[PDB]
């Protein structure tokens, strides 16, 4: 099976289905940033 | 169906604003609620007239010939209503509050409209005690985001006479939660070419919708929540983040929705939290909202005397992803002073 390792910079969308709305949008460069 | 055309314009606004942020703060974490930002600005537009009003909705991405002003208003009202409709297993609430100065002369129509049509709570607020006002508003936002958005407003102008806030809170469980017994305590995450940080790395092997975009050179993974929501992870190939950012659009999302196929993936996802803040005053100005800030601002639909103008705007948003699911919240602040 293919491996997907989210271990470097990525974009993230959180979507609501019924309205097709983007609730949140981001890019994670440093997940431990204070 | 009827909501889709709007949510699509809202999505392109999200990506355009995202790209402005990547210019403002390059190679840094970005995180925001586009629906929060859009919803707050549409609320303000409800009391605006003429070019003040048209600049706001055009800046949000609408074409008034394609979608008349009244249709935009009705649409956003329907959107907020639909998002707040109770869905089992999903916590999602989006709401607004208007903090109106003691001496403001708000139109009874504006107040009844926002209360009845736009999930708005109205509070009479004494801005003469600016410190206490700021605390009241911050505490309200904190409460409505289940404690997750703290200190939204850092400074409040002493001559403030109205504040409009929008808040969103989201908490959902993964359709397929991670087993914390399979989470690696300390795993490497590349933050730049020569530098890693350590994060807990969750791990499962499940069937997920995914694809490799052959044009954009990125992997796209969909992780469902247990009802009515999903997360999309976009992992560009080495060196391709900028080109992927340039390509993000509603068109790209529509393409991926067709191409996503469900199959087995050996999946590693970090457990983490982040937070981000944005001073949006100047950004919204650059994007086309001009008259709202001016001495000739037209908010004749809001107060008797057209007595206010926009002065400042800010957004804060927070995210946590862990084995059980995701919790995220955001809030938008719009400040008004005498015109
Ligand atoms: O893969 C599925 N498509 C989903 C996921 C999805 C993908 C994307 I990209 C976007 O963003 C987006 C799409 C579009 I078109 C536009 O214009 C914009 I602007 C943004 C969204 I929003 C969603 C989709 O709903 O489009 C998929 C669909 C349905 C299901 C699954 C994947 C899945 O795993 O099971 C279902 C599913 C999911 C949730 C739920 O509550 C019920 C349910 O039931 C069913 C029933 C059938 O028959 C088929 C699939 C699923
Ligand atoms: Ca371990």
């Amino acid at each position: 099976h293919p491996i997907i390792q989210i271990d470097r910079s990525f974009m993230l969308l959180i979507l609501e289905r019924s309205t097709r709305s983007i609730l949140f949008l981001g890019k994670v460069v440093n997940p431990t940033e204070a | 169906a009827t909501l889709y055309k709007m949510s699509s314009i809202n999505a392109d606004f999200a990506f355009n604003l995202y790209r402005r942020f990547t210019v403002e703060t390059p190679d840094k974490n970005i995180f925001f609620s586009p629906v929060s930002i859009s919803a707050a600005l549409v609320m303000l537009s409800f009391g605006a007239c003429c070019s003040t009003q048209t600049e706001i909705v055009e800046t949000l991405g609408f074409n008034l010939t394609d979608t008349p002003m009244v249709e935009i208003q009705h649409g956003f009202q329907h959107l907020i209503c639909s998002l707040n409709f109770p869905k089992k297993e999903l916590e999602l609430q989006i709401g607004n509050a208007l903090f109106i100065g003691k001496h403001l002369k708000p139109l009874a129509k504006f107040l009844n409209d926002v209360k009845t049509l736009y999930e708005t709570e109205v509070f009479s607020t004494d801005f003469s005690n600016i410190s206490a006002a700021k605390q009241e508003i911050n505490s309200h936002v904190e409460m409505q985001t289940k404690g997750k958005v703290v200190g939204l407003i850092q400074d409040l102008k002493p001559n403030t006479i109205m504040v409009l806030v929008n808040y969103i809170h989201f908490k959902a469980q993964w359709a397929n939660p991670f087993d914390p017994s399979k989470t690696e305590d300390s795993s490497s995450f590349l933050i730049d070419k020569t530098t890693t940080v350590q994060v807990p790395m969750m791990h499962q092997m499940e069937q997920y919708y995914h694809l490799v975009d052959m044009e954009l050179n990125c992997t796209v993974l969909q992780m469902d929540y247990s009802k009515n929501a999903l997360a999309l992870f976009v992992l560009p190939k080495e060196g391709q983040m900028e080109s992927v950012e340039a390509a993000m659009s509603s068109k790209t999302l529509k393409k991926w929705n067709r191409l996503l196929q469900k199959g087995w993936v050996d999946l590693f996802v970090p457990k983490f939290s982040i937070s981000a803040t944005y001073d949006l005053g100047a950004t919204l100005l650059k994007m086309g909202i001009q008259h709202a800030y001016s001495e000739n601002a037209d908010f004749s639909g809001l107060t008797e005397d057209n007595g206010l103008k926009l002065s400042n705007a800010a957004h804060k948003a927070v995210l946590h992803i862990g084995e059980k699911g995701t919790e995220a919240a955001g809030a938008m602040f719009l400040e008004a002073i005498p015109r």
Side-chain angles (χ1 to χ4, degrees), chain B residues 16-64:
Chain B
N16 285 331
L17 186 55
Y18 174 94
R19 282 184 283 269
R20 290 210 175 253
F21 296 156
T22 67
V23 175
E24 289 173 21
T25 57
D27 294 317
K28 288 271 184 277
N29 291 340
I30 295 176
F31 190 73
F32 68 104
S33 177
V35 70
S36 177
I37 299 175
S38 292
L41 289 165
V42 164
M43 181 172 185
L44 182 65
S45 82
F46 290 161
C49 300
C50 304
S51 59
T52 301
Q53 196 185 45
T54 64
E55 281 169 15
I56 295 165
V57 304
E58 287 172 353
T59 295
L60 290 176
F62 298 89
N63 186 330
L64 282 161

Side-chain angles (χ1 to χ4, degrees), chain A residues 15-17 20, chain B residues 8 11 209 222 224 228 230 232 250 253 257 262:
Chain A
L15 290 142
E16 192 275 344
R17 267 206 174 78
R20 302 185 179 179
Chain B
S8 179
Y209 282 98
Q222 173 183 313
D224 286 345
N228 190 38
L230 60 93
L232 290 180
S250 288
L253 295 184
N257 180 252
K262 186 168 256 197

Side-chain angles (χ1 to χ4, degrees), chain B residues 183-202:
Chain B
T183 299
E184 169 53 53
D185 293 349
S186 184
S187 199
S188 174
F189 187 103
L190 195 69
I191 69 168
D192 66 43
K193 177 164 146 281
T194 61
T195 311
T196 59
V197 297
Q198 298 298 298
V199 302
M201 191 65 72
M202 311 184 291

